Amino acid sequence: SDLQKLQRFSTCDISDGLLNVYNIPTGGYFPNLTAISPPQNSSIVGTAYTVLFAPIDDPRPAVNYIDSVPPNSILVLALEPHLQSQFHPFIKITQAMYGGLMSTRAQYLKSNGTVVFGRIRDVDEHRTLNHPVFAYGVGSCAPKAVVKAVGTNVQLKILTSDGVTQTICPGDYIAGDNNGIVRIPVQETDISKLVTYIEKSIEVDLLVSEDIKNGIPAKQAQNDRRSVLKK
Amino acid sequence: SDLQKLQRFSTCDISDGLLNVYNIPTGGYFPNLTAISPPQNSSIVGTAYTVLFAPIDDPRPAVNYIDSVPPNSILVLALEPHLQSQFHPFIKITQAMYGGLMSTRAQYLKSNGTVVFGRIRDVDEHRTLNHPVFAYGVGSCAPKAVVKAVGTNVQLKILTSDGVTQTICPGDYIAGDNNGIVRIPVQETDISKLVTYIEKSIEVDLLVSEDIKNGIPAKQAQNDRRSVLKKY
Amino acid sequence: SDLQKLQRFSTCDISDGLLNVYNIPTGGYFPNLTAISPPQNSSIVGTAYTVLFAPIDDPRPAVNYIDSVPPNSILVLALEPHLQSQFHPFIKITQAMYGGLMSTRAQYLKSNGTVVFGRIRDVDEHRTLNHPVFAYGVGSCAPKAVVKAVGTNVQLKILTSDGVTQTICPGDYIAGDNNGIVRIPVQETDISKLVTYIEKSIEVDLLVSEDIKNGIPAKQAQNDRRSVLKKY
């Protein structure tokens, strides 16, 4: 399946596909997330189940997002953009928006992992569960007094640290590894074409590496990769 | 003692008490500190022994804070607010304010750990000593060209990344773990009431965890188990 | 050799020399770099082989920097200052500027490690190679759309988080460890004088550590043991 193929790729491989096939200059990268609870295996990949948090004074009612987390999803939480910043810590609240009971439930429902564009708490609990969680940072405090979830399966706008606000839609493919988080925009991407290119790119990259290990200069090795991938 | 009871709580549990018993919206959290030298147990707790630093040209004389660190303290160092920032690295100097010899002495004096709202140096020495140290970051250089300690057991004002300045008073309880640092204001707190609440809240959440692992939805479990907390 | 002598020192020991011998208030520290691919040994040292990156629209041609990395170098990459920031993430691009293939070639050439004033990609590849790399952060994306290398062995200017811009020249000595990165500016300092001082200072600080473990107050011990350093 789509997911299965993507699970074999690093986030770097996926960005090479997005950059070179779709001319996306950032390669679909969402920067400055840390794997607080790392995946056991190489990467996590899944379809985005998005959740939007707003100030508690917002007129929209609080929603229960966690109890409907889909199997094989990546659960993706974000704040209203006014509470985001272009500089670390990247959000303007000190409270966490997601803790260990949330990971417990998401794991029960067979989610592949969580990306929080904000803070998590109960660091050791996520790790003990072995539930993968990426976040900007950590907190000790529940969100009660400041924010609440107001939307699920909505578009998420993320103010990134290059000044550009990038978006994540429901059903987008999310991949995370030690290089961070990438998103494949499913509306706009022919997954077969992308996967085919990425597979070839991995083959060619491996040969650049082996060229170098065998004493061939990088310039020559990179030139030959370019020549191959051109076609 | 209450310190012994607090030692068994995570910082999240303590924040649950401060938020719910005292309506402290941030739950006493001081954000963005890293456990550069981590606790040997889960958490550290102690009474705040505060130390304020200022520019070297300030007329307040330099003080020797390290040699009077009390037993069972948490040693807490901060700069004046004008040297702090709401954005990482959270302070405007690159020099460290605290090194390996400092931990050696603080530990000798039986301090429970250090929190530096600034940079520390000699990372490997703190770690070899197993002396817990939380800080904003690290440096390589001593502070003497730029800042000095000018006060002990004074109020510390910490400009935090939500824009709000929070305070730490001498004798406040400070707790630290992998979630960061929380402070309990002791002048404004009935510690017994707070400890009792936190106990009950911990109990509730263990029960919720069990429920969720048994296939009960989180909302249902939380609403069922947490009802009892209102009367504490 | 100089590098062999420096290899025995922590970055803190080196900053002690730069601060005390040369009155360099920051001790040559370049702040906020993380050891994303940590050294196997305690520290890395080498002579700086510098690489400057600029926007792709810059009139200078892209260059091949990696195939000429010298043995025993530290490869140092930086952006033009206008692409830098005083706050994290310290650069204004999300793309990586250095990946796994570059460490592969640098390692082949016997470079001692890399410092990137920017983001690196292929985290696991550097680690698998056991090639030391310090950087501001990570990325997943190649730099093709945004920046290119435009010079080698040119001056680098680093806007640091205290607001001061500090420079790195080819042939400067670079040291890195868990405290971060320090640079010895060889055209402003005498290496033999610095090495001699540092060696003495390390001995002094050992004695202070042992004094503190004997119950001697730290500042007293410092003043006593460090008196010998005054003549230098």
C85 near B CB under 8 A: no
The number of angstroms, rounded, from the C-alpha of C15 to the middle of its chain's C-alpha atoms is: 12
DSSP string, A77-123: EEE-GGGB-SSTT-BS--S-S--HHHHHHHHHTT--EEEEEEEE--H
Of C15, C32, C218, the CB nearest to B141: C15
DSSP label of C68: G
A130 near C CB under 8 A: no
Between helix A218-229 and helix C100-108 the angle, nearest 10°, is 150
Cβ–Cβ gap C212/B137 under 8 Å: no
Of the candidates B16, B10, B21, B25, the residue with the CA atom closest to the CA atom of residue B191: B21
| Separation CA B164–CA B166 (nearest Å) | 6
String of b and e for B164-184 (b: at least 16 CB within 10 Å)? eebebbbebbbbbbbbbbbbb
Residue A82 backbone zone (phi > 0: left; psi -120 to 50: alpha; other: beta) = alpha
Cβ–Cβ gap A31/C100 under 8 Å: no
Q: Give the distance from residue C129's alpha carbon to the nearest chain A alpha carbon, in angstroms.
A: 11
The annotated binding site of A for substrate is made up of 99-102, 121
The three state secondary structure string of chain B is CHHHHHCCCCHHHHHHHHHHHHCCCCCCEECCCEEEECCCCCCEEEEEEEEEEEECCCCCCCCCCHHHCCCCEEEEEEECHHHECCCCCCECCCCCCECHHHHHHHHHCCCCEEEEEEEECCHHHHHHHCCCEEEEEECCCCCCCCEEEEEECCCEEEECCCCCEEEECCCCEEEEECCEEEEECCCCCCHHHHHHHHHHHHHHHHHHHHHHHCCCCHHHHHHHHHHHHHHC
Beta-carbon contacts of B35 under 8 Å, excluding residues fewer than 6 positions away, are B132, B133, B134, B176, B177, B178
| Separation CA B147–CA B55 (nearest Å) | 4
| Separation CA A23–CA C46 (nearest Å) | 38
Phi, psi of C176 (to 5 degrees): -140, 140
Write down the residue that tokens 């530290």 correspond to: C74
| Separation CA A154–CA A54 (nearest Å) | 13
Distances (CA, A) of C92 to B38, B136, C96: 32, 22, 11
**Best to test chain A binding among B18, B26, B160 (most A CBs inside 10 Å):** B26
- Confirm if A138 and A98 have CB atoms less than 8 A apart: no
Sign of the alpha-carbon torsion through B107, B113, B118, B121:
positive
- Confirm if C126 and C104 have CB atoms less than 8 A apart: no
Chain A from 176 to 205: CB within 8 A of any C CB: 177-180, 182, 205
Phi, psi of C200 (to 5 degrees): -65, -40
Distances (CA, A) of C171 to C5, C102, C187: 16, 20, 9
Contacts of A89 in chain B (CB under 8 A): 31-32, 87-88, 161
DSSP label of C82: G
Burial (CB < 10 A; 0-12, 13-18, 19+), residue A40, is: exposed
Distances (CA, A) of A216 to A149, A200, A205, C144, C152: 54, 21, 14, 22, 21
Tokens representing A164 are 């550009």
Residue of chain A minimizing CA distance to C109: A215
Interior angle at CA B158, CA C134 and CA B188, nearest 5: 140
Phi, psi of A120 (to 5 degrees): -115, 160
Cβ–Cβ gap A219/C145 under 8 Å: no
- Confirm if A177 and A115 have CB atoms less than 8 A apart: no
Residue of chain C minimizing CA distance to B124: C178
Domain layout of chain B by residue ranges:
1-232
Tokens representing C62 are 């892209």
In 10 A of CB C231, how many CB atoms?
Answer: 6
Interior angle at CA C39, CA C35 and CA C44, nearest 5: 95
C162 near B CB under 8 A: yes
| Separation CA C44–CA B123 (nearest Å) | 15
Sign of the alpha-carbon torsion through A55, A56, A59, A64:
positive
Residue C150 backbone zone (phi > 0: left; psi -120 to 50: alpha; other: beta) = alpha
> How many CA atoms lie within 13 Å of A95's alpha carbon, on the beta-carbon side?
24
Antiparallel, parallel or unpaired: β B29-30 and B180-184:
antiparallel
Is C109 annotated as contributing to ligand binding?
no
DSSP string, C129-186: HT--EEEEEE-SS-STTTEEEEEES--EEEE-TTS-EEEE-TT-EEEEETTEEEEE-T
| Separation CA B186–CA B184 (nearest Å) | 6
Q: Which CATH class is domain A1-231?
A: alpha beta
Is B122 annotated as contributing to ligand binding?
yes
The amino acid that residue A174 corresponds to is I
Residue of chain C minimizing CA distance to B109: C215
Of B42, B162, B215, the CB nearest to A94: B162
Contacts of B88 in chain C (CB under 8 A): 87-88
| Separation CA A178–CA C119 (nearest Å) | 13
Distances (CA, A) of C181 to B85, C15, C29: 22, 10, 6
- Confirm if B19 and B171 have CB atoms less than 8 A apart: no
Beta-carbon contacts of C45 under 8 Å, excluding residues fewer than 6 positions away, are C3, C6, C7, C74, C112, C173, C174, C175, C176
| Separation CA C228–CA C206 (nearest Å) | 14
Of the candidates B146, B144, B155, B170, the residue with the CA atom closest to the CA atom of residue B68: B170
- Confirm if C121 and C133 have CB atoms less than 8 A apart: no
- Confirm if B111 and B74 have CB atoms less than 8 A apart: yes
Cβ–Cβ gap C177/B124 under 8 Å: yes
Distances (CA, A) of B99 to A36, A113, B23, B123: 27, 39, 37, 8
Cis preceding linkage at B89, omega within 30: yes
Which regions of chain C does DSSP assign to beta strands (E)?
29-30, 34-37, 44-55, 73-79, 113-120, 133-138, 147-152, 156-159, 165-168, 173-177, 180-184
If residue A180 lies in a helix (H) or strand (E), which one and from where to where? Answer: strand A180-184
Cβ–Cβ gap A139/B19 under 8 Å: no
| Separation CA A106–CA A75 (nearest Å) | 8
Looking at the domain that runs over C1-232, which CATH code has it been given? 3.50.30.40
Cβ–Cβ gap C121/A12 under 8 Å: yes
Cβ–Cβ gap B179/A140 under 8 Å: yes
Cβ–Cβ gap B32/A66 under 8 Å: no
